[PDB]
Each structure stands twice: as structure tokens, then as C-alpha cells.
């Protein structure tokens, strides 16, 4: 069985700046009661519980990246980090996942992909930011309306941000959420979005 | 953005009374708002949770039945219909408006809503 | 049904110490409760969200923790303006309903 310390399942799944992060091969997850490294950022994690019964019988689990982090030459993908997430007194982020903000006051449509060339299942996961109101959105993306079209051979969802005021939960009052789905090998995933996606850097090679 | 009361005063044991919740700005909507009454000493009861547009409607066990809410589509108003009332309901009357929402704060999600936009507050009394 | 249960029911305390107030739930509510502050003849006050968010305006001697069915609220040094009574709010069951806490009275000793 695997000891998370003090981490739950998504905040080591997504790499929480505060979560250490193993050896592989478990036949059970132990997480903490109310562990101190959750979500960073706010938010919820779509479909949790279905994906904590898939993880609880696995056989082997290794960090591959799908998209380099160097991969984004048309978007910016280093000035994503927030108060909410801390690492050593600074600003960070999601360390499998990246905050993609807009470069030089731009922001074109990305059309990226990537198909699983890998003998094993690949979970990749991902997520959406919805901003506190029109001038942020405008501040992080340009772009007024946006959407995001996350496509696999199993898969086809079409994320829209809302906007509302909330109340500060880490500090902030935007939010988050997160999906993931499985991608069998000989298949892609095909992503298409023009704002507010927090675009995967590392996935995850499973096997059960 | 603020929120004004409306609606309040004196009626009789069994009468009825409109209370109305208006805001004062333009709504980004998918809010709700609540109603909180407080009788003289007491505290805080919660009352009844309204989704801003009117589609979902809430109420407490004791005005079950009594309470509804009603709208003058000739306007843009949303009431809160207090009917049957009784002694028990002579209280101060808040509206508040919440953000309902789903977060991941523990092992599993869970609903979070809270009321961080309040009205200044409308006395109801029923006496004779 | 979710019953809130708050304690002490008041304290008094000199103006810099500080206070504890503690708040109970009949089962688990994750970490939707809130705390809420009123001051005399006003509405209440929305101070900590999700059991131990502050929220913009108020003091950071306000301090809120718990989760579960157990939850704390603190002032790290009490001071004049603070005299009102606390309460503590639940959300999980919403939207069907929700349901307050019988509130905390903050008195001064001068």
C-alpha cells in the first residue's frame, strides 16, 4: 500500500509545490484525514472518486511528459503562479500542469496533440481556470469569449469559463477544475482552446 | 453591489405579507439568495434559499406550506410570500446573497455557499 | 437534519488576550462552515469561509480552523470594536437547506 505524506491523492497526482513526491507497485492508497496540501488553487477535481477507485489495484506508475514546458513558442508559460500555492516564500504552481497566460497581448488558438506511443495506458489530466470577472480575463487571456475542446477516440467535452464574485478560499477568488481521461495506446488526445487552459506537462503511464 | 429590503411591518395573526429582496446592481447570476429571520433576542433561524431567477426554492420545516414565492411579471420582482403568519414569526427579516458552489477541500467535494452581501434588515410583527 | 452547537455560550476577556470559540456539528461537513459576526442592531458579517479562509475586510487576528464535525474560530487579541456575537454557519446541505450555530456572545473586561 502507498503512505501519501500528508498529500492527497490530486495534489500528488498534479504535483503540488508544497507535496514531496516514491516507489510504485501498490496494492492500496492511504492519504491523510484533512491533509495540509490539497488543491492549492481552488477549485474541484471532476470525476475524484471514480478515478481514486481505478488507482487502488495498479501495477506499475511512471511519470512520462507528454509537452515540454520549452514546447510553447506562441503562449506565455512561466508567469503562471499564484499566492495560493507557495514554494519557499514565492509564487508557484502545479508542477505537472502549466498556467498559460498570454504573450505580448495576444492570444491565438492552440491546436496542439499528442497520441500515446507508449505499450501502456496513459492518464493525462488537465484543467480550466474561471477568472473573478471581465477585467481579468482580459488581463490573463485577451480573449473575451473562450472555450476549451478536449477530444479523445472515447472522449469529447467543450469547457466554457464562468465568472462570478466568490469568496477568497487560499487567498484568491478564482477557481479551477480539473479532468482527466485514459488514452489507450495507437490513440490521441486533441486539444483546441483559445484561453484559460492549464495545458498538461507530465502524464502518467498506469497499468492495473 | 448592494441589497435593499422591502415589505415589512405590522399584520395580523393569519394576514399576509410581501417581503421583496432588490438588488441594487446587474447580476452575473447563478447566485441564490437566502432569507435569515431573527426574533427579538434569539438568534440567527435560517428562513428560505431562492436561486436569483426564481427556477429552484427552498423552505424551512415551520413556514412549509405558509411561505411561498410569487412574482409581478409585469415587473422585474421576486417576493417572498409570507401567509398564515403566526406569533412566531415576528422577527427581523435579512436577505443575503450567496455563491453556491462545489469544492475539493478534504478527501471528497462537497456543496459551499456563503452569504457575503447582506441588507440592512425588515422588522415583521403580528400582533392584534 | 444538521444541528450546530457552539461553545462557551459567552466570555468575557480583557482587550489584547485572546479568544476561543469552538463550533460542533451532529455529523460531517467537510469544511463547509462558515463563521459570521454581528455587531448590535446590524447585519451579520461574513468573517471566515470554508472553515479557515479569511476573507477581505476583516482582521487577520480572526483566525478560523476545524473540520469534520469540530471547528474553531480565534482572535489572536481582542479588541474593543470586536464585542458582538458569533456564529457559525453550516453549507453542506445546501440548497435544501442550511442551518446556524446558537452563537457565541464576545463581552469585554475593562
Known amino acids: 500500500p502507498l503512505i501519501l505524506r500528508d498529500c492527497s491523492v490530486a495534489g500528488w497526482l498534479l504535483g503540488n509545490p508544497m507535496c514531496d513526491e516514491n516507489v510504485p507497485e501498490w496494492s492500496y492508497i492511504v492519504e491523510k484525514a484533512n491533509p495540509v496540501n490539497d488543491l492549492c488553487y481552488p477549485g474541484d477535481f471532476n470525476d475524484y472518486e471514480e478515478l481514486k477507485h481505478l488507482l487502488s489495484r495498479i501495477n506499475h506508475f511512471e511519470k512520462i511528459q507528454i509537452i515540454p514546458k520549452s514546447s510553447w513558442s506562441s503562449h506565455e508559460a512561466s508567469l503562471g503562479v499564484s499566492s495560493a500555492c507557495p514554494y519557499q516564500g514565492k509564487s508557484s504552481f502545479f508542477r505537472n500542469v502549466v498556467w498559460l497566460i498570454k504573450k505580448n497581448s495576444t492570444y491565438p488558438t492552440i491546436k496542439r496533440s499528442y497520441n500515446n506511443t507508449n505499450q501502456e495506458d496513459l492518464l493525462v489530466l488537465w484543467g480550466i481556470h474561471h477568472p473573478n470577472d471581465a477585467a481579468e480575463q482580459t488581463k490573463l487571456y485577451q480573449n473575451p469569449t473562450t472555450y476549451i475542446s478536449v477530444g479523445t477516440s472515447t472522449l469529447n467535452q467543450r469547457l466554457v469559463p464562468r465568472i462570478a464574485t466568490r469568496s477568497k478560499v487560499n487567498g484568491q477568488s478564482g477557481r479551477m477544475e480539473f479532468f482527466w481521461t485514459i488514452l489507450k495506446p495507437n490513440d490521441a488526445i486533441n486539444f483546441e482552446s483559445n484561453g484559460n487552459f492549464i495545458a498538461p506537462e507530465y502524464a502518467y503511464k498506469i497499468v492495473k | 453591489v448592494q441589497l435593499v429590503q422591502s415589505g415589512g411591518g405590522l399584520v395580523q395573526p393569519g394576514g399576509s405579507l410581501r417581503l421583496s429582496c432588490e438588488a441594487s446592481?446587474?447580476?452575473?447570476?447563478?447566485?441564490?439568495i437566502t432569507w435569515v429571520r431573527q426574533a427579538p433576542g434569539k438568534g440567527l433561524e435560517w428562513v428560505a434559499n431562492?436561486?436569483?431567477?426564481?427556477?429552484?426554492?427552498y423552505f424551512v420545516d415551520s413556514v412549509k406550506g405558509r411561505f411561498t414565492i410569487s412574482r409581478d411579471n409585469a415587473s422585474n420582482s421576486l417576493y417572498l410570500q409570507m401567509s398564515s403568519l403566526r406569533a412566531e414569526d415576528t422577527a427581523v427579516y435579512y436577505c443575503?446573497?450567496?455563491?453556491?458552489?462545489?469544492?475539493?477541500?478534504?478527501?471528497?467535494?462537497?456543496?459551499?455557499?456563503?452569504?457575503?452581501?447582506w441588507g440592512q434588515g425588515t422588522t415583521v410583527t403580528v400582533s392584534s | 437534519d444538521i444541528v450546530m452547537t457552539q461553545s462557551p455560550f459567552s466570555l468575557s476577556a480583557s482587550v489584547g488576550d485572546r479568544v476561543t470559540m469552538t463550533c460542533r456539528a451532529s455529523?460531517?461537513?467537510?469544511?463547509?462552515l462558515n463563521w459570521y459576526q454581528q455587531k448590535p442592531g446590524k447585519a451579520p458579517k461574513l468573517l471566515i469561509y470554508?472553515?479557515?479562509n479569511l476573507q477581505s475586510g476583516v482582521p487577520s487576528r480572526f483566525s478560523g480552523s476545524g473540520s469534520g464535525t469540530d471547528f474553531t474560530l480565534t482572535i489572536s487579541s481582542l479588541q474593543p470594536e470586536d464585542f458582538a456575537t458569533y456564529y457559525c454557519?453550516?453549507?453542506?446541505?445546501?440548497?435544501?437547506?442550511?442551518?446556524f450555530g446558537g452563537g457565541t456572545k464576545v463581552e469585554i473586561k475593562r
Open positions: 443575503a446573497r450567496g455563491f453556491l458552489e462545489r469544492l475539493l477541500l478534504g478527501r471528497q467535494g462537497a456543496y459551499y455557499y456563503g452569504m457575503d452581501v
Open positions: 446592481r446587474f447580476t452575473s447570476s447563478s447566485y441564490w
Open positions: 431562492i436561486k436569483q431567477d426564481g427556477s429552484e426554492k
Open positions: 455529523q460531517s461537513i467537510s469544511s463547509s
Open positions: 470554508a472553515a479557515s
Open positions: 454557519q453550516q453549507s453542506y446541505t445546501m440548497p435544501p437547506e442550511l442551518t
